[PDB]
């Protein structure tokens, strides 16, 4: 496989206006990030990120 930029863009923006970075999302363990972006990517990509 996956492109990190493509995935982060797929989740973009960061809800503040700009694209988020990996450092922006430290952020939360796997389950609640799968919840907060449930409709916006798949399980495998979540694992990847």
């Amino acid at each position: 496989m996956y492109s990190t930029a493509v995935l982060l863009n797929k989740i973009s923006p960061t809800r503040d206006g700009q694209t988020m970075t990996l450092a922006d999302l430290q952020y939360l363990s796997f389950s609640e990030l799968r919840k907060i972006f449930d409709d916006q990517l798949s399980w495998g990509e979540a694992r990847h990120l």
Binding site: S29, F30, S31, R34, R47
Partner: protein, 49 residues
């Protein structure tokens, strides 16, 4: 069921603790279990019980 507590009991007999707790968590964990990045719905980490 038997071998995990075999190892656990021996560890406790040698004043080792943290590895013993890590070991016995294989059979029970009050904090529940983590599988596939998620909290388990079962209660005991051994099916027959």
């Amino acid at each position: 069921y038997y071998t995990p507590m075999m190892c656990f009991q021996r560890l406790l007999q040698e004043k080792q603790f943290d590895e013993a707790t890590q070991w016995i968590n294989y059979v029970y964990n009050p904090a529940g279990y983590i599988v596939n990045g998620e909290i388990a719905p079962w209660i005991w980490n051994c099916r027959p019980l």
